[PDB]
Structure 1
Amino acid sequence: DYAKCVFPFIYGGKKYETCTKIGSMWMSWCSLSPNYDKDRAWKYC
């Protein structure tokens, strides 16, 4: 996929694969573009 979830991706330079709560709320999110760095590279999961 290239508009839903690629992986592996780089959350703000943290690196991740599947979704990730990262301290969210009983859930998590996924990264759209490969590198995240905050470049609208995600969506909540």
Structure 2
Amino acid sequence: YGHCVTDSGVVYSVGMQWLKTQGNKQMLCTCLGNGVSCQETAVTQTYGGNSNGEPCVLPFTYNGRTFYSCTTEGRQDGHLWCSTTSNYEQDQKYSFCTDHT
């Protein structure tokens, strides 16, 4: 009835995007309306960019929002990129991402 719970105790809320692990793999879990879905891996391969590819540091904050993985909200081209420094608004250290092609 709105609130989202993973049966683990975490009483999320309809729209409290979060991140869940599998004791080895990463996975972003979110509660929409029909239930609770997630994004396997979440992250993506990083090449060149500003960090020549490296372990991003998400979920980070950009433009005032948050991103648990790559994103193209910082450009008008469509190239996926991520952050490698908790402080991207100070360092600007970011990397790109493929995902598809």
User: Which range, TM-score by smaller chain?
Assistant: 0.5 to 0.7
Which residue does 2:60 correspond to in 1? 9
How many angstroms does 1:18 deviate by? 0.6
Q: Which consecutive residues of structure 2, in runs of 5 or more, have no partner in the other structure?
A: 1-53
- Please say which structure displays the higher CA radius of gyration: 2
How many angstroms does 1:6 deviate by? 2.0
TM-score by length of 2: 0.34
Which residue does 1:20 correspond to in 2? 71
Contact 1:11 1:35 in 2 (8 A): no
Which residue does 1:36 correspond to in 2? 88
Instruction: Determine which structure has greater relative contact order: mean sequence separation of CA pairs < 8 Å that are 6+ residues apart, divided by chain length.
Output: 1
Higher strand share: 2
Alpha-carbon RMSD:
2.2
TM-score by length of 1: 0.58
Q: Which consecutive residues of structure 1, in runs of 5 or more, have no partner in the other structure?
A: none
